[PDB]
Each structure stands twice: as structure tokens, then as C-alpha cells.
Amino acid sequence: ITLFVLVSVVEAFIASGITDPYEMYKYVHVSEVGNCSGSGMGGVSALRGMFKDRFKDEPVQNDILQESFINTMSAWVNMLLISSSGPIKTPVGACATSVESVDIGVETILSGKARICIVGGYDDFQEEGSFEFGNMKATSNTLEEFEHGRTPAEMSRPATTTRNGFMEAQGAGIQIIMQADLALKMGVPIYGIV
Amino acid sequence: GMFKDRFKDEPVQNDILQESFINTMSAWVNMLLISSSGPIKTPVGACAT
Amino acid sequence: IPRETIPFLHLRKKTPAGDWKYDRQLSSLFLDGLEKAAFNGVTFKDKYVLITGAGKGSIGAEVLQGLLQGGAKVVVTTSRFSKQVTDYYQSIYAKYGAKGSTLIVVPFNQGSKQDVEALIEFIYDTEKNGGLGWDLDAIIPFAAIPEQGIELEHIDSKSEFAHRIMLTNILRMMGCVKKQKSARGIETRPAQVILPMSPNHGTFGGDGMYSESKLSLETLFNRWHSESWANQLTVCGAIIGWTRGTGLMSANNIIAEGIEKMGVRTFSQKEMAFNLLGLLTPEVVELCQKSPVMADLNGGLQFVPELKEFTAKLRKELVETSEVRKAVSIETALEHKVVNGNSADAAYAQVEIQPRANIQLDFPELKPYKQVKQIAPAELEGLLDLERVIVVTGFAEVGPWGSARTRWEMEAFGEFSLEGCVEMAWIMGFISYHNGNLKGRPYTGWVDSKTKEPVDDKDVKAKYETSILEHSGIRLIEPELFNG
Amino acid sequence: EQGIELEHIDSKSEFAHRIMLTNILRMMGCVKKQKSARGIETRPAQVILPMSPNHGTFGGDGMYSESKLSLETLFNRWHSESWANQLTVCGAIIGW
Amino acid sequence: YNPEKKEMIQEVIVEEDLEPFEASKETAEQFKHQHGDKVDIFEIPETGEYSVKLLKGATLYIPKALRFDRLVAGQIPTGWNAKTYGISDDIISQVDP
Amino acid sequence: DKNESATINEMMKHLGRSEGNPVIGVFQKFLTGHPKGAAGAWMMNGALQILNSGIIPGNRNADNVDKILEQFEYVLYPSKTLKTDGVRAVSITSFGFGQKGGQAIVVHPDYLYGAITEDRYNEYVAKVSAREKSAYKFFHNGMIY
Amino acid sequence: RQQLQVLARYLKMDLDNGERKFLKEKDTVAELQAQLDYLNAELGEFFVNGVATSFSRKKARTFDSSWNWAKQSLLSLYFEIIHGVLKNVDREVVSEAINIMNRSNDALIKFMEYHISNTDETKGENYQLVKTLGEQLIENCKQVLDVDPVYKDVAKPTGPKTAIDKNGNITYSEEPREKVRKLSQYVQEMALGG
Amino acid sequence: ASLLLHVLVAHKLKKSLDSIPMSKTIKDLVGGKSTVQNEILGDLGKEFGTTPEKPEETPLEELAETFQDTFSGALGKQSSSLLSRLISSKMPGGFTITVARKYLQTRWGLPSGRQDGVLLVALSNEPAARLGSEADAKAFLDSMAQKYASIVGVDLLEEITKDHKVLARQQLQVLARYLKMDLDNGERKFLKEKDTVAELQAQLDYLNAELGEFFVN
Ligand SMILES: Nc1ncnc2c1ncn2[C@@H]1O[C@H](COP(=O)(O)O)[C@@H](O)[C@H]1OP(=O)(O)O
Ligand code: NA
Ligand code: NA
Ligand code: NA
Ligand code: NA
Numbered sequence A: 001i002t003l004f005v006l007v008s009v010v011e012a013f014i015a016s017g018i019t020d021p022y023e024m025y026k027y028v029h030v031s032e033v034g035n036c037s038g039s040g041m042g043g044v045s046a047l048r049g050m051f052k053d054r055f056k057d058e059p060v061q062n063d064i065l066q067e068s069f070i071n072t073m074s075a076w077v078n079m080l081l082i083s084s085s086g087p088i089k090t091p092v093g094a095c096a097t098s099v100e101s102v103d104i105g106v107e108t109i110l111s112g113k114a115r116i117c118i119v120g121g122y123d124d125f126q127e128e129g130s131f132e133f134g135n136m137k138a139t140s141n142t143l144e145e146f147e148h149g150r151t152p153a154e155m156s157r158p159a160t161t162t163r164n165g166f167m168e169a170q171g172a173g174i175q176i177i178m179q180a181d182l183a184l185k186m187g188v189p190i191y192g193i194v
Numbered sequence B: 001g002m003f004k005d006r007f008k009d010e011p012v013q014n015d016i017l018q019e020s021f022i023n024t025m026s027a028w029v030n031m032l033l034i035s036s037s038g039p040i041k042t043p044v045g046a047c048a049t
Numbered sequence C: 001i002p003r004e005t006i007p008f009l010h011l012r013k014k015t016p017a018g019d020w021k022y023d024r025q026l027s028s029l030f031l032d033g034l035e036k037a038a039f040n041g042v043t044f045k046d047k048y049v050l051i052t053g054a055g056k057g058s059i060g061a062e063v064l065q066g067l068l069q070g071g072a073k074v075v076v077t078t079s080r081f082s083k084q085v086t087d088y089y090q091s092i093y094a095k096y097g098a099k100g101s102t103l104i105v106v107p108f109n110q111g112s113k114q115d116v117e118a119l120i121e122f123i124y125d126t127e128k129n130g131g132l133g134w135d136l137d138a139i140i141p142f143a144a145i146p147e148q149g150i151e152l153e154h155i156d157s158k159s160e161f162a163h164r165i166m167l168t169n170i171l172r173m174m175g176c177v178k179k180q181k182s183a184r185g186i187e188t189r190p191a192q193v194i195l196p197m198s199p200n201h202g203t204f205g206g207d208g209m210y211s212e213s214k215l216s217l218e219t220l221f222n223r224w225h226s227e228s229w230a231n232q233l234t235v236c237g238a239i240i241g242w243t244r245g246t247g248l249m250s251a252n253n254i255i256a257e258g259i260e261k262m263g264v265r266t267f268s269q270k271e272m273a274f275n276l277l278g279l280l281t282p283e284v285v286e287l288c289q290k291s292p293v294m295a296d297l298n299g300g301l302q303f304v305p306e307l308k309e310f311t312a313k314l315r316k317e318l319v320e321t322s323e324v325r326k327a328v329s330i331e332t333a334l335e336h337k338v339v340n341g342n343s344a345d346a347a348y349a350q351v352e353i354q355p356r357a358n359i360q361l362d363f364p365e366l367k368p369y370k371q372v373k374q375i376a377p378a379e380l381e382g383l384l385d386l387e388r389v390i391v392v393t394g395f396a397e398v399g400p401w402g403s404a405r406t407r408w409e410m411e412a413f414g415e416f417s418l419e420g421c422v423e424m425a426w427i428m429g430f431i432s433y434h435n436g437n438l439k440g441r442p443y444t445g446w447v448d449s450k451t452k453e454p455v456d457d458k459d460v461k462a463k464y465e466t467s468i469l470e471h472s473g474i475r476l477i478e479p480e481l482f483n484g
Numbered sequence D: 001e002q003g004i005e006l007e008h009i010d011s012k013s014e015f016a017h018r019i020m021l022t023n024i025l026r027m028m029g030c031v032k033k034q035k036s037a038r039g040i041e042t043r044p045a046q047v048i049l050p051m052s053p054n055h056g057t058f059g060g061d062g063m064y065s066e067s068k069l070s071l072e073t074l075f076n077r078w079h080s081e082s083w084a085n086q087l088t089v090c091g092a093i094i095g096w
Numbered sequence E: 001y002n003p004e005k006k007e008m009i010q011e012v013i014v015e016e017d018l019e020p021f022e023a024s025k026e027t028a029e030q031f032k033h034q035h036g037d038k039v040d041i042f043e044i045p046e047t048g049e050y051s052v053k054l055l056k057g058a059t060l061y062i063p064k065a066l067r068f069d070r071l072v073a074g075q076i077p078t079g080w081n082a083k084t085y086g087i088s089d090d091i092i093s094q095v096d097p
Numbered sequence F: 001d002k003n004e005s006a007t008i009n010e011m012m013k014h015l016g017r018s019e020g021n022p023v024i025g026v027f028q029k030f031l032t033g034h035p036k037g038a039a040g041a042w043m044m045n046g047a048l049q050i051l052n053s054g055i056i057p058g059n060r061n062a063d064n065v066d067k068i069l070e071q072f073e074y075v076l077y078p079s080k081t082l083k084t085d086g087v088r089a090v091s092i093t094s095f096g097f098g099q100k101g102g103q104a105i106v107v108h109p110d111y112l113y114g115a116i117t118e119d120r121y122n123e124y125v126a127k128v129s130a131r132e133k134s135a136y137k138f139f140h141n142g143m144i145y
Numbered sequence G: 001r002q003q004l005q006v007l008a009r010y011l012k013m014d015l016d017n018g019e020r021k022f023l024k025e026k027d028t029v030a031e032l033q034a035q036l037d038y039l040n041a042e043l044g045e046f047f048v049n050g051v052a053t054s055f056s057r058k059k060a061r062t063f064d065s066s067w068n069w070a071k072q073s074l075l076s077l078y079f080e081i082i083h084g085v086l087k088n089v090d091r092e093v094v095s096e097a098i099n100i101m102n103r104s105n106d107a108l109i110k111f112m113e114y115h116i117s118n119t120d121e122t123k124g125e126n127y128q129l130v131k132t133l134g135e136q137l138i139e140n141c142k143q144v145l146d147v148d149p150v151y152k153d154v155a156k157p158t159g160p161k162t163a164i165d166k167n168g169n170i171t172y173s174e175e176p177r178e179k180v181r182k183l184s185q186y187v188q189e190m191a192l193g194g
Numbered sequence H: 001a002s003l004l005l006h007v008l009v010a011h012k013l014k015k016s017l018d019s020i021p022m023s024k025t026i027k028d029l030v031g032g033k034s035t036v037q038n039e040i041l042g043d044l045g046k047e048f049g050t051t052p053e054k055p056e057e058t059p060l061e062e063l064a065e066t067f068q069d070t071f072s073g074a075l076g077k078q079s080s081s082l083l084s085r086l087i088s089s090k091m092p093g094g095f096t097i098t099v100a101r102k103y104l105q106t107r108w109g110l111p112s113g114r115q116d117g118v119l120l121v122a123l124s125n126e127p128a129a130r131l132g133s134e135a136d137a138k139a140f141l142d143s144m145a146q147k148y149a150s151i152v153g154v155d156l157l158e159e160i161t162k163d164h165k166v167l168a169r170q171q172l173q174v175l176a177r178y179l180k181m182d183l184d185n186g187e188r189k190f191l192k193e194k195d196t197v198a199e200l201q202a203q204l205d206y207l208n209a210e211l212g213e214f215f216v217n
């Protein structure tokens, strides 16, 4: 999950024409670049290492616990790219964490605690999660879909008569948000007003 | 229950996943006591949450 | 209609002698139906129809568009049930499906006795029993498979099967809806069967058992009288004429213009669909209930003699003219080259430019101020604290459709640009950049990651797109991606 | 086939139709192939087709009428296909 | 939980065919699905249950026990019970502590 | 999908949205599936791309719209892409386990430039144009190497 | 080997029962295989494969949401005219008008009324064109509200044209028929014969 | 069907039979926990086959009578799975479901139908941990036989020769191992062939369904 976030953050800075994160510190205090991105379950592969692989006495990094936490994707982003000493408010919002993130991000800038904020959500897919969503009957039953002659392409069909559960996926999404006044000053692209 | 008890085919509630999430303590509080339709912003902050 | 003249579309009456001759009166009834239909339209509201053989590119599909436009409720069979076919019929309904219309697509093999019985059971069964709870008003059994190059001595498995689809299981299908109606004491809602008949029975040869299939259907004109099913089914034979396919280059289309020079009419699929939908007008529905109807929809083709030898001559003369011109062309080209040299024809061959991908960041377009100031109210200028306006400055994703660039192409357009295709090929590791010698020659650009063979951007789509789509988006879980 | 109307047409009738049409076509085809194999262009076999004047006139004949009517294609296939030197067709419309 | 006796499991490869044992058809089929060649299952004609012969080459998990060296924790006082605060049995069994 | 349709429909009904002016729904998960936490970040990326392109993508898997949703007269469920002559604002709505409701509104960025002077805008346009050329330089180098 | 044998005898174990049952089953396989082979010899592979079942009630897709598709059709027409994809000559705009009329209800009229009335003709000739087409289409839909919908093919009827260039390439186009521009005229052509 | 439905709904909510009154509905008993309603309806479909129109709103007394009209008295897939798990997870080593039916036939003289009832009652009084001794397992089934006696209203050595046949059986096994004899190869090949018979029989049955006996003969 941390790899998906690192790639997403990098690509998002490039989409904002910020090639070197440290450019922000020409315009802004080290204390005023924040990360309000979050996750529903976080590093679930690390959770398996903790709870299952350890139980089987399979070899597992001694720091595996650190890698499971929802707030360590944002930690690696700061420790590898950003180097901010700014806000770090990490939402758990299940399927809504990305919008919760934007909300926290907006309020964090409007409070004066930050002028730029990384924002968004991320979650992986793994055996255990898939099974549990199945036990809750939240996900489409693929054998039922096949009985109905549905191909995988057409198994996620919102607002349809025959819709029959959600199709689970994996990945990350990052936005960079800032004061319009700063965006204009920095001459970065402006894709939308929150 | 999700990662170990299931693996051992020990019986485990089918909604066990819902009960693991950081944001469902706050859900039960709202669903049993408060009944607010107000903000719900749930931080993960390790030792600083 | 000039008396002494037989129209290009007419109905027929059975003479006591037993032949089906043109009838001026019935033909007037039908042709007036068509004229009315063309100016004012025909409604099919409250008409329940089963149609087999309505695949894309067919006459059936043009009939189906019409039924839906008129508010019919229709069951379409497909023997090629698939997401492509499912989406095809959805787009037809989304375009033509009138108020009161419904379209029901079912997989169905008219070759299978079991499918025939199961389909009719499904149509007639209650909604409580997972059926449609319908009672059919029209059956259009156009399902068929081509037989070509199969003369008498070649007739085998395919032909015997084809004959099952195109005759024996049509009888079975009719019999089933007869049984279902009678079972429920339905004596006063006959289903009109639009039989697809042929004017030419082993005229051309090599059609396997096509001609035997299509001629056999002509018994139903008499069985309607002689058996106990007249109140349940009515028979409406359409003698379907020469029908130019999807309007592309066919071996049959190229001689159509030639056939028409004889004073004879070939038909577009829309024309033939109109002709056929003209048999579901209230007037001819009622005519079918009196006695079996027979509609010649064969553009006076009956009247050109030795139709096979003539057809065959038209094709020979076209092909001859083409072949000799192509040969004489190639030879005068070579005679030029020998006389003038390979110099003369290097100062001829143009230089073509193939595209390379040029992936863009797509920053938003900034319009000139005069134009952008018209968007927002005049009053907004200097009204906002811009430190308290929050703005998205950049965005990105990692997901089933690659980057935000590639996902957007797929979301919005359903297919990749060159730039989309090259980005996916790069993400997925199909291709890697290379800059240095490749087998002693210097090379700059894409290379297949496995073979290290060079790859032009123009070839990326042909080489890798099928795999990119097979292994992107929502698909079967690949164990290598989730730790086995 | 007796007492078999449209809705009764099943195994017996589909089989009867095989005897009385599809395997007659097959039989003709075989003697065509055997003659041609031996370059026999000048000894046609005369096929006395047993045809019917009544096609679903009486009803309840299963697929009798479809069998007997189908045979009438051979009047045209003799001209349109490559077997005219091997088989000749002689339809007998057999009465009561 | 006893930090002095952590329960773990060790993968071992069966060196010798095991003694057969009885199990449901459903369970026997589950064993067969996992082990393939390396287990035989056979219907017991009388009972309708199945015999399960785990064969040489099959993988087993044999419980073993670790001594851990964090023996102490700040724990909510012994006897604490959500029930004494008024929380229903139905909430207690639904919800994480 | 029913709950969401009903809550959007009632938001519009209460704020007196014009009869005959339904919001146009995009259902991005037909293509991507549901990535839990990231769900709304993908939807936001899409909203931004819609605003800037003026293109509203179609739910290509909307084979048949649930009859139950006809009642929500302020929602349109398109099956195919519309190239519009502009989109001024987009609603992103999210619903998570444990009563996590969410709405963001994103407004078209050209509404910002209304607030500043011609001089300031022109300076910005110059500066972005330069940054963009440099970003393209960075991106292509970073991709191939 | 002999010690095993005497132990088997004592236990009343029948060491060969398994192989006995197998040999018997192997025979009934060959017996069935021959019956199935005979049917393939008589009917042929094409027929035996061909006669396989496809129909299945659970694969029945059902399309009935015309109420939604009308508003989509309308908006697609509207923007095609604004962008000049459709012009005031194209017959596609007459037939797409028929399909909208064929779905006229109170909601559809309210939808067109909103969109057509709120289009600003001053934005360009295409906006004026759609506003006029729109007003006319609303008037139509009002009249045909409470009228049975109708099959009306308004397409350009065509005839075959075959051409062979100087280099013997064979072209086939579908060309407009001389004196036959619409189906009213097609019916006339058919009545007169030849 | 009333004992079978009571036990399945009681065991799901993890409550004794007396805690769940049969006058209440599934929707009622579940509270707002629709996650658990979907499981009970899935379990009743797995068990009996079909279901009334709205089973969640039908009181369990009434649901029982609808199932009773189409019920053979046989245990069905869901009950059988839960009784297999009860025995395999809560009974002491070697105490099979077959050992537990031999004990209910020997000690209490109950045939296959009544043992089905004793084990259903045992499932709704499922011990929390595995029982320690064969003594504790018999003590449990004795207590569960008397609870079944209440609910249905009913009133309640050649082991040396077996011990030798076990020795003989094991001596055979070690000799077979030494000889590299695969005593079960025969049965293995038979099971495989029996499957390819059913496979062909189905192909031949399908052709008879399509063409009919008259044509195929
Ligand atoms: N076995 C079959 N069962 C049903 N319909 C068939 C079968 N084989 C072919 N068809 C249909 O016959 C039609 C013939 O059309 P045409 O007039 O172009 O010959 C096809 O488009 C096809 O529809 P589909 O392809 O959906 O099965
Ligand atoms: Na899943
Ligand atoms: Na919890
Ligand atoms: Na290019
Ligand atoms: Na994505």
C-alpha cells in the first residue's frame, strides 16, 4: 500500500508541476506543508505477517508492526520526499476516507496550520479482507454472476436492476491542495476549487 | 479473529471485519447513545492519536 | 397500380387449382398499409413478439429496431450471447425503445429441442415461477446458419443440423406455443408466424439443405386448415427477395446493380424490414386470421429467366474485367520499370511519417483574461480572501486502469490513444526504453522487455493492447499479484 | 406417422423425415460419388421419387408432407449442381 | 494469552503414511482439495462418513511453544465488566473489547 | 445506490433545483471497482478531469436503470459519454461502514480568475506556462529512465 | 508377501476387491464410449456438438428503462447540434426526434422545457439552431403525449453501385436512388413495378 | 421441521432454545442486525430448499408448518455441516459422530431419526471448549438425551476380539509398507473410472433428451 501512495504522491506533485518538493519551502514555512491522507485498513499484508506468518514461525521483519499502521504510509512519504514539520492528521473513514481527508485538509489550511496539504486515500486487496466482505455479503458472488452469464467487465453495474454487490479493488489516490493565493504566487496549475 | 481464528476454521462472527475498523468504536457510540448526524473524523496517530 | 402490372411487393390468393397467384385486391390492402405506415408510422404497442435470427447486420435486427420504435415487447434470442452482444442490444433499446416497449435478450440455440421447449416455457410461465408471464402475438423465426459449397453429395452433419434449426425446430417452436395457449384455453389471441420463405428452391445449388428447409415451410399454408391449431397460430409467409447485406462489398452485392438493369428490385435491409413490419399492420394481422397470407417481397426477380446462368454471367464479366485490368496493370508497371530503371520509381514513392507517442501532463488551459472574466460575476473581483479559497493543484492515482491519465482515457473514451497504450505498455513492463547499441547498430526508443527486440510506438497497440486489456481493470484474481 | 399434428411432432417424426428425405438425398449423393470416382459420365441412374399431391391436406401425418414436398427441390438441383450425368430425377405423384 | 507459553505452529513434512481417521464427506473433500496425491479419502459404506489417510510427503502443522520476556502490562483492574456499567450481553458479544 | 440516489435527490428538491434539471450521475466504480479508502480520491480525480474537459463519462454497465430510481426525478443515469459545452461544479458523495457520510463540491477553476486583476492573471499564466514545460521535461526523463 | 496374505485371510480382507470393481467399470466405460461413438458416426461431430443447450432463464437480460434513455437521447442530440456534429440538413436529427417523441411523458417535457428555455441563442448560430429545434420538439412531444408510439423509418433509401477503376480494383457503394428519396416514394416505386 | 428451525436460529444467535420464543419473527429476534438476518435466510434456504415469500416477517411457529409440508424428516446440508463441526471440534480424540450414534443406540436405545434430534439439541447446548475425556462426552450426550426426552415427550463384550483384529490390521500395514504394496491403488482406479462412466452416461442421456428414444434406437 505504501508503494501505491509513494507513486501517487510523486505523480501528483508532477501534475502540480512541482518536480522537487523542497521548492514548496521557497514559498512556505517547513511547519505549513501537511499530509491529511488516510486509509480504511492500512498495511493489511503487514497485519497478516503479524497475526498469521508469525503464528506459523515463518520469518517476518521485526519492525512489521510499524508497516501495518494507517499513519506510516504518510510517514514514509515525509521521510523519503517531503521533509515537512507540518500537520499530520490521518483519517480512518472506511469507504469514505478520501472525502474525510479533503475535509480535514481544507480545515487544516483554513485554520492557518498549513498552506499546502497532501490529501486522499489508499487501500490494498488481500485474501482475508476479500473473504470477510464475502461473509458480510457486501461483495458480488462471482458464481452467481456466472450463472447470470455476466463477464467480469460487467460485474460492477451501479444503479442497475440486477446490481448484486460491490467489486473489490486496490490502489491509492492523492490530491495536492493549497491556498489559491499561494497557487497563483507559485504559478502551479489549478484543476478545481474545493 | 480475521487473520488467525478464521485460518484455524474456528467459528467467528461473519461481521468480524466491521468490528476491527478504528472508526467503528465511534460508530457504536453514535448508534447506541448520540444519534448525531454531525462530523465523524477519526484519526490514526499511533501514540499521539 | 397499372392493371396488367404485378407490383414488386404483392400478396397472393390460392386458386382452387392450388397455385398461389397475385391478387390485386389483397395486394392493395398491403401496399396501402405500407403507404400509411411510411407517412404516419405504425404502432406495435401491446404486441408481444418472439424473434430469432436478429443478430447485428441482419434483416432481423432492422425488424427489431422497428418493433421497439413502435412500443412492442420483444424476446430476442442470440446464439452468440456475450458482453459485446448484450451491450449491442442495450444500445438498440437505449436508442429506439419507445414508451411501453421492453426488450428481453436470452441465449438460445434453435438447434436444441430442449432450448425450444425451455424458451417457450419461460415466456409463458408466471413471474412468480421466474417466467415473463407473456402470451405471444407474433413469432419471427429467422434463426439460420449458412450452407455454401454443399451440393447433393456433400450434404452431411452441418446440413442435417441446419435443416433442424430452419424447419424441424420451427415446427416444434410453433407446436410449443400452440400447447401453452391451449393449456390456458386461449382460443382468441393467435400468434402470427412470419415464415421466412424463398422464391428459389435449388435454383443456385450448393446451399446444402437450405432449399428443402425453406420449401418444407410451405406445408404450413395447408396444415393451418387441416389440424387443430388455427386459433393459436396464424401463418404469414414472407417470400423474401434479394437483400444486399450490410451495404459493404459482397460477391452478391457487386452483381445487384447488374440484376436491377433487368427492371428488377434488390432491397436494403431497412427496406426488407419495412416490408416485413408491414405484415404486422392491423389490416394484414386480421387477414392472416381469416386465411393464411403469402407476401411476395421479391422485387419481380421471379420474371428474369434462367436466373442462375444470368447471375453467374454477371459475376464472370465483373471478375474477368477486374482480373485482366489487374494483370495488365502489374505488367505495364514492370515494362515501365525495366525501360526506365528503379531510379524512375524512387522519384515516385512518397515518404510517410508514422506517429510516435507524445504523452502530455494536460495542465488546464488558461483562456485570455477578457474571456475568463465573463465567466464569474463582475462583483467577485477583490471580494474573496484567496488564502481561504482551497484549490486542487495536482492529482494522481494507482489503480486497476493505471495512472489518472490512462484511467481517464478508459473511463471517458473506452479505448486508449497511442499515448495511453504506450503508458500502459510501460507501466505493465511490456516495453522498456533503450539508448545505446542493439546488435552493433545504435538504437533509441522502446524495446520488448523479454526479447529486447526494438518496438515502434505505431506497433505497440497491435503487439500489446490485447494483453494490456486482458490484464487490466476488473478481472479474475491473479495469484502472483497477491502472494499466491 | 398417424395422429401426429404440429404440436405432436417429436422423435418418431424427426426420424421418419430422416428416412424419407435426408437419407434419400444421402443415398443419391453416394451413387453420384461412386459413379464420378470411376469417371461414369454416361450411365445415369434414374431416381423414381415417390411424391405426394397432398401436402398437409389431411393433417396428423407428422412430417410426411414436409418429407414429400422437400423432394421437389431435386427437379431444380438436377440443373444447378454437378450430378446431372450420374442421376436423373423422375417424380411419380402417386395417387390413392 | 500466557506470555510464558506463546502457542505457535511449525510446518513439518510427513515422513511416513499416518493412521487413517474418520471425518465428514465435506471435511474429507476439503483435505483432498488441499493435499491432492498426498491424501486418500474413501467413503465408509455403512456410516456414510469418510476415512482420511494423510500420505508421506503431506505437510502437517505441529503446535510448539515460545517463552516470551514481556511478562508485565498495565491492565484494567481484574473484575472489570461492561455488564456492571449497564452494557447488554448482545453488545458485549458483537463488539471488540 | 438507492440510498445515495434518494439523498442526492432530496438535497436538490430542498434547495429548489429546477424541475427538469436533474444532476447527471457518474458511477466510476463500473470501470475501477471499489478500492475502499481510495474510492473517493479516484472520484475526485475524475471530477477534476470532467470540469476541465467538459466531458461527462457514461456508466457503460448501466444496461437497465432500476425502475425504483424513476421516482428520483432530479437524477439522470447516463449509459454513454456526453461532450458538454462545460461543467461548472461536481458533487462527490461517499458512504462508508460505521456511518461515514461524505460530500465534497468541486467548482470549475476558471471561477477563481474572476477574483484577480488582469495584470496578476497574466503573470500567473506566464509562470504556469514555464513550470509546465519543465514538468514535461522531468516526466519524460523520469519515465524512460 | 506370504505373511501379509495369511493376515489378510484372518481379517477377511479382500485385497483384490478394488481392482475387481475397476475392471468391471472400465468395461462399462468402453460400452458407453461405443454407444456415444456410434451416435457420432451417424449424426456427425457438427450436429452432436451443435445440439448443445444455451438457454438459461438466469441469463435473460431485460431492458425497459426508456424513461431514463429518453432524457439521455435528448441531451446527446442537444450537444451534437451545439458542437456541429449534427447540422440542420442531417436526417439523423429527424429520426432522433421521432425516438424522443416516441418516449414523450410529463417528465421529458419538463426536461426539454428546462434545457431549451435555458439555452442562450446569443452564444452562436448552433445555440440558436438547437433552441429552435428544441422549441419545435417540445411542441411535438406535447401533441404526441397520450399517442401510441410509432415505427417510422425516415432514412435515405439507397441502391447498389459497383465500379471497377483503371487498375481493376472492384468498389461497391450504397448510393442514393434517383427518384426515391423517402419510403412514401419507395411504396409508389413498388406499386408501379417494372 | 419446528425442532430443526428452532435449533438453527437459536445456534446462530448463540442462545439456548428457551431464549428464542417461536412466536417471534427472524427480523424481530435479530434486532436491526440485517447482517445476521441474511445469514439465517441463507441457512434456511441451504437446509430445506425453498422458502415462503417474506420469511423474516413470518413467525417461526408458522415458518415450521410451511417447511413441514415439503420436509422428508432428513437433516439436510446445513444441519449436517454444523453437527460434523460440533463432533470434530468439541468431542475428545477418537469420539466420532458414528461412536456418538453407537452410544445413543446402546445406552438409550434410539434409532437414526431420534439420534438426529438428540444431536440437534446437543448443537444448541454446544460446549464452549472440547470435552476432556470419553466419560465427559457420554455425560454430555446423557444430559442431551434427557433434554430431547422433554422436547418430544418420551420416557428413558467382544472388545478383546476387536483388540486382536486391530493388531493383525497394523502388522498387515507394516508388511505392505516394506513390500512397497499400494493396497488402495485398485479402489483409486475404480473411483476414477466410475466418474468417467457418469461423465459419458450424461453425454448419452443428453443426446437421448435431444433426439428421443425412437430416433436414437
Ligand atoms: N443456432 C442458432 N440458433 C439461433 N439463432 C441462430 C443460430 N444460428 C444462427 N442464428 C441467427 O441467425 C441469424 C441469421 O442472420 P442473417 O439474416 O444475416 O443470416 C444470425 O444473425 C444469428 O443470430 P445470432 O448471431 O445472434 O445467433
Ligand atoms: Na472481494
Ligand atoms: Na467493535
Ligand atoms: Na503523437
Ligand atoms: Na484507477
Ligand code: NA
Binding pocket: C086, C087, C090, F063, G061
Ligand atoms: Na446486459
Ligand code: NA
Binding pocket: C086, C087, C090, C091, F060, F061, F062, F063, F079
Ligand atoms: Na450497457
